Amino acid sequence: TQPALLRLSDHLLANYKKGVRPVRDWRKPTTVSIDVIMYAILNVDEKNQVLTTYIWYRQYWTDEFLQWTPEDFDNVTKLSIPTDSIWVPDILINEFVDVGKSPNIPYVYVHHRGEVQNYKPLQLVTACSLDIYNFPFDVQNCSLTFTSWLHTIQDINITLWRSPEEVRSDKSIFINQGEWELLEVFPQFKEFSIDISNSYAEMKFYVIIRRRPLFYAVSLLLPSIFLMVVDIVGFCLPPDSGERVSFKITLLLGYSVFLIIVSDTLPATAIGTPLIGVYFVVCMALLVISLAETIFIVRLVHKQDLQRPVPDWLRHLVLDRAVRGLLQELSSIRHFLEKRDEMREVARDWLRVGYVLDRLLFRIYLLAVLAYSITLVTLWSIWH
Amino acid sequence: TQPALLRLSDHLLANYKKGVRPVRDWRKPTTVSIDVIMYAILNVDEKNQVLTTYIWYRQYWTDEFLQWTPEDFDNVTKLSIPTDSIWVPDILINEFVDVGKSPNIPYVYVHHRGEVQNYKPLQLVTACSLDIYNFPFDVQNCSLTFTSWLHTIQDINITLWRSPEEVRSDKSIFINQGEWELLEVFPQFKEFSIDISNSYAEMKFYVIIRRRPLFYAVSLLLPSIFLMVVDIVGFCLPPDSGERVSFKITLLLGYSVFLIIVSDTLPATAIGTPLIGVYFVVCMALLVISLAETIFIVRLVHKQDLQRPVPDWLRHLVLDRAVRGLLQELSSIRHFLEKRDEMREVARDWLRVGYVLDRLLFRIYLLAVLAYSITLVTLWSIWH
Amino acid sequence: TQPALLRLSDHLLANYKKGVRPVRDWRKPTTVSIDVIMYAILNVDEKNQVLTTYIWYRQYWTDEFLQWTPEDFDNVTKLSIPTDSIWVPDILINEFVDVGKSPNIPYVYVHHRGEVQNYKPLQLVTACSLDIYNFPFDVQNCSLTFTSWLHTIQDINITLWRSPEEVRSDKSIFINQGEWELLEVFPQFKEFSIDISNSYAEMKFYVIIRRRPLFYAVSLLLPSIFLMVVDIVGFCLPPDSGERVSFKITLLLGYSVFLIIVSDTLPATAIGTPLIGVYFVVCMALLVISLAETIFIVRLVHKQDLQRPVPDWLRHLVLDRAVRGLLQELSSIRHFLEKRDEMREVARDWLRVGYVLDRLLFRIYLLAVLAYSITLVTLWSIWH
Amino acid sequence: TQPALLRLSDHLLANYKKGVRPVRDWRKPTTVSIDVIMYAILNVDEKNQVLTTYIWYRQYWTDEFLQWTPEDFDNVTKLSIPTDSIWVPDILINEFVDVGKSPNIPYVYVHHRGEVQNYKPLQLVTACSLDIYNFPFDVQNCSLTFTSWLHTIQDINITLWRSPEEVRSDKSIFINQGEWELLEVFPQFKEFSIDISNSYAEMKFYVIIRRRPLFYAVSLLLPSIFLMVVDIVGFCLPPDSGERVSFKITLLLGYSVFLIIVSDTLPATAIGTPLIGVYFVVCMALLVISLAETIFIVRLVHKQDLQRPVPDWLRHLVLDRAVRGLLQELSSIRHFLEKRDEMREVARDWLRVGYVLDRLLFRIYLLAVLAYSITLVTLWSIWH
Amino acid sequence: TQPALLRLSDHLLANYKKGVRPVRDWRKPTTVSIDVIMYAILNVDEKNQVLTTYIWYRQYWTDEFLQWTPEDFDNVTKLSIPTDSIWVPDILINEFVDVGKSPNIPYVYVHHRGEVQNYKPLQLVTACSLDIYNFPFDVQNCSLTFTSWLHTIQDINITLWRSPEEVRSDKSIFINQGEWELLEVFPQFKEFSIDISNSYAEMKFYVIIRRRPLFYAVSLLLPSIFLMVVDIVGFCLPPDSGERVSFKITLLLGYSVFLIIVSDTLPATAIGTPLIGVYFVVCMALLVISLAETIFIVRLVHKQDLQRPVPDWLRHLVLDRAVRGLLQELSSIRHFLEKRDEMREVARDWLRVGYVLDRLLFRIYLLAVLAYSITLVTLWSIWH
Numbered sequence A, B, C, D, E: 001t002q003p004a005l006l007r008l009s010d011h012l013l014a015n016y017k018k019g020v021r022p023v024r025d026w027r028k029p030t031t032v033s034i035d036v037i038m039y040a041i042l043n044v045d046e047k048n049q050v051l052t053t054y055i056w057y058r059q060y061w062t063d064e065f066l067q068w069t070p071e072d073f074d075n076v077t078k079l080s081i082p083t084d085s086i087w088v089p090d091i092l093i094n095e096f097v098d099v100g101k102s103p104n105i106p107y108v109y110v111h112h113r114g115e116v117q118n119y120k121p122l123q124l125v126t127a128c129s130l131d132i133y134n135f136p137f138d139v140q141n142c143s144l145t146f147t148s149w150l151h152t153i154q155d156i157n158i159t160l161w162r163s164p165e166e167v168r169s170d171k172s173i174f175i176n177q178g179e180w181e182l183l184e185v186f187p188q189f190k191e192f193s194i195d196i197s198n199s200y201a202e203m204k205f206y207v208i209i210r211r212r213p214l215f216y217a218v219s220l221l222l223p224s225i226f227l228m229v230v231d232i233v234g235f236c237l238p239p240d241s242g243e244r245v246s247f248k249i250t251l252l253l254g255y256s257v258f259l260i261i262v263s264d265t266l267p268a269t270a271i272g273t274p275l276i277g278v279y280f281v282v283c284m285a286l287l288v289i290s291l292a293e294t295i296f297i298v299r300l301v302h303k304q305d306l307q308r309p310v311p312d313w314l315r316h317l318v319l320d321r322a323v324r325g326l327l328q329e330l331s332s333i334r335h336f337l338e339k340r341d342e343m344r345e346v347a348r349d350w351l352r353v354g355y356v357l358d359r360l361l362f363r364i365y366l367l368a369v370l371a372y373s374i375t376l377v378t379l380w381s382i383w384h
């Protein structure tokens, strides 16, 4: 006789119709069992709010036409037949915004009771809501909604292959060393409803992914810390040097270029910018405050050859915390030297005031950045 | 007997022709009812003027060959049959400039009266007219024109599934947290005409989308405001410092780099640049005016050792608003000191004039930027 | 009896062969009439010299096998049959460098005389010659060559559906608000020839597109004008300030960064760079000339404490256009003051010369940029 | 009689079923022999951790239905038949994250014993773990896992065509002049297991690729070396020039721009940044230390007209290693000159201290960068 | 009777098998004649070492089953039949690293002797070895290897349609105005061999393409020449100005930014960087040498108020090539003036030395850049 697989396949696929839903009684829906195993988080685009993942998805349903008695076919209990030869449910993801390029699986396993098993890998580009409020430490909760696109609850119902606890803790194949860490996938069944009669089976997997901040620690924190360090170094220049203000403005321009170039990576959304943006703005205010202090002190100590002398209150407050023709003609010589000396001494008194005030405002700025830095490391421990 | 679905499908699809338009009388057009549900605004490219969206589109038409009496087939009233087994109208969008990658839906529902229901998701890349005059606050009105590509009004006519008010206010599935907010989609029926006989059914959906400015507020307004703040800070430097002009030119270079880098995002069109461009140009004029004032005041107060003394009109106008050999040889000594002192005093008089004029032109510039800023916040309230 | 469309389609498509060219006499070529309607200029890549457009293309040919008498089929005069069921000529564009993603049109109209009408939209990526000599105002003349890829003049000949004047002035559907304005499309028929026998039908449409310069006016002209304005402002700084040369070099660095960033947009070709490049180089020469004048004047007026006094010719040319021990020991005091005063006066004389020469060379540079600017606006009026 | 190939193909492919696994006894698995020949490493994306390669992959299995006696068919021993006409195992790579665009091979060779030979080229985009710890010199070890997607060990088993030593040392077609050098590919057989019964054949090829550092030597090392050279040159400027600190800050800004622009190429991962990042940070610390030394020395030698004189310990430590009205009125003149001279001499003493300390701290910094450079060249020899 | 084309096609394609290689005797290989006509060089990616071209490729082979006597079919000598209806050899390019998007040609010409003619355009992405040693003037020699992927020499042999001299000089359709100029394509036949029996036909076309340097002359040479010009201008600033060193460092930073931005275009390879990189490094050394000369001269002439006087050897070498209380108290006044004057004169002597040495080192640098520029223009003439 002929081989068992040839006889079995010829018996099953003879006068078999792919278009008909395989039920002998049309009132019975084909319950399809869904299982999803996350393999990789290929991309998370916050600008377009799209998530590209790869999953291994296996489903099984009872085909009431692909049934046989194994004892009549040399005790064969299951066989593989082409996917395009049998009816396959139109179960797909609601959140699609594209089609994913994935290998086509040509065969499906069929058991002697009709239990067709369809294993396939598929790449999904799905629209998801991304909360970028705490960008470097954000936890994204994206829904993949498997449902029959056309058939209602009365034709195709969806159940879960494994128990929800098993699929929740499944990380057997996930590519872990990416930017995103898979926390869990959470299945939940519900019915979509257009009206009373048009109700659709639905299975939502809540893929939860946490961003790894070690990708971005160097990218954001290190340059800003450098800039603050150099700013703190810049106060050691004397206020009367004239280069100190140029130093400060050059540093501000550099950190502004840093902000501009970083903004191509730091994303944004309509709900609001990440708190990293707020801390960058606070760093900006700190640098602008340092520049304004430098400019004020430069205005204070300038050798402008016009200064009235320091007022008594200012002086005390600062220093508490620090032959007749020949005779008359020589008098003009000493008067001009005295006029220059008195003017020069006045400029020194302003310089003496401006030096210690530069020191005093350096300590306050030193403490202000110290309090700000300790506040940041405290909040980081909470996010960590 | 055989199962109802097998018998029904075999009866319907036997000697069924896909190429023929399913009408028993060829004079009757197949009225196709169109429904469009916007799911996401994937992209709006102003440079190329193309809009990429995703829609859920459902249509239904009466197939006069897919009719049966349910009482003869075990009371089955509707069944799903493959899309590629039956005639499907060639209804597509006129504004296509590409093909969208969308899932292929294999099945369609058919009721016992022949009412075929085709549900499918599709991504559309369509040419649209984008008015970028008020870029951060623009409201775009893009037309999606569903029509039968080949069949005229005498073969395929297009109606609307739901009432126009229902489709106008449909936001049940729209992904809202993107850059674009869907205001409404507006359906309108009209007939395209090549001649008297060649008239085509047409249904234009006017997708109206408003850009969310919170994406761009930080991107444009914040750096410019920073630059103006630093410019205002720069006036506190003394005019005779010599660094003030370097400060101003460095700031101008920084803001020019800001303009250059921002222009990769701020789009343009043949109709005209956005008013944001005009306000950036006005900010540019303000910075150039501040730089010119700095350069003029520096030219005024310079210690050039060549100045003639301040004219009487200028002085008043500004200050209203603020042994014989031994004897003759010593006279040369006091004369040279007097010559230096008189020259030094003249330089001081120019400095006294230039100081208050720097203050006076600082107040005017302070008020000019204040009036400009209040004007901007007033117009923003209207756009908001 | 059966419906007319079913009977007609069954009669036509029974024993119909798609592979055969539909002529009862094989000597008669199938004359295909071509019509092209430009819809959008999607992209013009000057770097790769490729033009991506979208067209609505309709063709019609006489199929001698799809003929019937309408009075025998309930007076049906035309019917739509699937495109993949009948012979379709292999007419495509010679200039292809890719395949365009375009919707597939499933049906074609067939009249009772056999006149098959095939309407289809198609995106074309075609190699074209782009003359970038006058880049902002260039008029590109790109050829789309529709021809039968395989069949010679003896099998497929190509004619034009409409008169050439009608297709020349066709702008009914063109998307006008893009960067490119369609001037006309010009059809011309010719025969390609490999040898005497192997001659091919050919129809060249000369798509002529003019770039809209309002896209680029802001992008190129405005920043350069700004830079020149600031350069003109920079001369007001005194030559002895020392900051003027730093101002000029900073401005030159800024405009060089402008040139670098702009070059990512301004294209180039082997024939030659656009004249915009030449005018940018002339602006570069103007800025370098201003910098060299600043450096020369700074070298002239420096307080170098070493200057020999101004020569008589230079002075006139410039100013035409502007007790014994006690006695001897006091003499040394007045001599040292005289030595310093004479040296100081010499430095003033050089400064007096350098000041007016700075003014004189400022007027010449002011006129040179004025002549250059008026020359540019004159040539712009010709291009406009 | 008919030609041998026609008769043989007609005999083989008559009543041949593609869906059945070609075994006369269904208990016998189809052992498929796998061979992989690497052709090119198209891309290694460290950001997404994906490897795109091209391979020539040949497989062979025994088809028990495609068997014939050559003496009955004119001594034909093998023939090519279309790939889509016979059963082909569903062997693919587990690590897929996309589908590769590769030519479709239409034919396969079949020998008279049934040995089908399938040669095909395929592009693979596979997820791989990339260790970027020593980025310029890293050796990546990426797994390509060929397995039957559906069939278990009981239906399809996988062996190796050639001996493992032959495939390990195979570089016959590899494109060598790319960025990556193929060290070896290592085959290893194992069984995947879902449970006791569901075990799958598996063949892992460990493609080992070493990056060529000559691509990146110029990109990273050369600019940093330049920056250090210029920094070393900058110490030759006198500390009192005032421009030295501006020189240092400008150099620091330039090298920071270098770091920013380079970071678009230097990748990162969650495990940790490459040691090149650590050496760049050490270079950053060196530049900041040089800037701080410059600022400290500038603070030390400033002509601030306020300095108390150098303390005795500091001085020694540094220098070890380097008519009554007329009479009284003239006394004021010499006193004022003495007051200025003593103040001027004090400023000189501070300058004398700061000069040699600048030299002394220049030698230490010269030795520190020398030790750092020699340390780098030593470690480079180990990596080389 | 029926039309000739219908009868002929029905006679030929009845019981015609596509899978069989069309030979009546299986020992006779099907000699396929190859012809390749280059149409465009779409892209040359030196980073990935891939060449994307477009070719018109025509092949012809003798099909021994598609033969007829024309006198029996109304004297028809050739006819077009669908490509997918007849056997087509699996000839493709070995160097594929992708699949090219090209139009599908549906028909092929068949003559009455069986000579099938297959014309088709195809885009090829092929791995090629790119020698970037002389990047702007490089001549690339890339191999396209047409061979039968599966069939050996015993089944499919490959010959050339035209004589090798005709295909060598073929430029009839090449798009010439691109970046690459096609010098020639060179065909050569060889046999690949796996073993003694498994030998494969092979035809290598050596596409030779020369880069047009006019694309890049402006891109590289012009900015560097500008930078050198400005550097030469910078020497005219006096050494004691203090701004000269700032000028030089700003220029160096600008040219470094130029190098950084240019490196995104100038490619690299493992064999070695292009000589343009070496000349850029030499320009870098020239700028660093100019900066070091400026810093040295600034160190030489500084008004540091500490200089010992110029040594006798240095001076000559440089200048060869250029009442008791009242009496004693007045003596202190002249002594202090003498002390200041002698110190001031010493600073002048150092300035006199440093001025001419700046001139002398300017001439040497002027000649060094002149020799370097003449050397470059000489080598350019050889490359040109």
Ligand SMILES: Cc1ccc(Sc2ccccc2N2CCNCC2)c(C)c1
Residues within 6 Å of the ligand: A094, A147, A148, A149, A150, A192, A194, A200, B037, B056, B057, B058, B119, B120, B121, B172, B173
């Ligand atoms: C008002 C309204 C009516 C029906 C729907 S449903 C839908 C609409 C178009 C295309 C497909 C569907 N679906 C049906 C089953 N579920 C998958 C998608 C909606 C959303 C609104």
Ligand SMILES: Cc1ccc(Sc2ccccc2N2CCNCC2)c(C)c1
Residues within 6 Å of the ligand: B094, B147, B148, B149, B150, B192, B194, B200, C037, C056, C057, C058, C119, C120, C121, C172, C173
């Ligand atoms: C002058 C003219 C004639 C006919 C048309 S129509 C058209 C033309 C080519 C291809 C398709 C069409 N269409 C027919 C039905 N509507 C969808 C597209 C035009 C625009 C101008």
Ligand SMILES: Cc1ccc(Sc2ccccc2N2CCNCC2)c(C)c1
Residues within 6 Å of the ligand: C094, C147, C148, C149, C150, C192, C194, C200, E037, E056, E057, E058, E119, E120, E121, E172, E173
């Ligand atoms: C020397 C030569 C011979 C023939 C041609 S033609 C050609 C060649 C290959 C593939 C296609 C064609 N074509 C035939 C009909 N026209 C469309 C393209 C040439 C150019 C040179």
Ligand SMILES: Cc1ccc(Sc2ccccc2N2CCNCC2)c(C)c1
Residues within 6 Å of the ligand: A037, A056, A057, A058, A119, A120, A121, A172, A173, D094, D147, D148, D149, D150, D192, D194, D200
């Ligand atoms: C818990 C668990 C169960 C089964 C698998 S396997 C798998 C799952 C879905 C789709 C395909 C597969 N495969 C089967 C044979 N090998 C190739 C892929 C896993 C991973 C976990």
Ligand SMILES: Cc1ccc(Sc2ccccc2N2CCNCC2)c(C)c1
Residues within 6 Å of the ligand: D037, D056, D057, D058, D119, D120, D121, D172, D173, E094, E147, E148, E149, E150, E192, E194, E200
């Ligand atoms: C060791 C070795 C054996 C065979 C080959 S050949 C080859 C291998 C796999 C897939 C295809 C081929 N080819 C056969 C005919 N020529 C085109 C490609 C090699 C390279 C090494």
Ligand SMILES: *[C@@H]1O[C@H](CO)[C@@H](O)[C@H](O)[C@H]1NC(C)=O
Residues within 6 Å of the ligand: A071, A074, A075
């Ligand atoms: C099938 O299995 C049964 C036991 O399960 C055994 O008795 C019978 O012999 C088997 N048939 C064949 C053909 O092996």
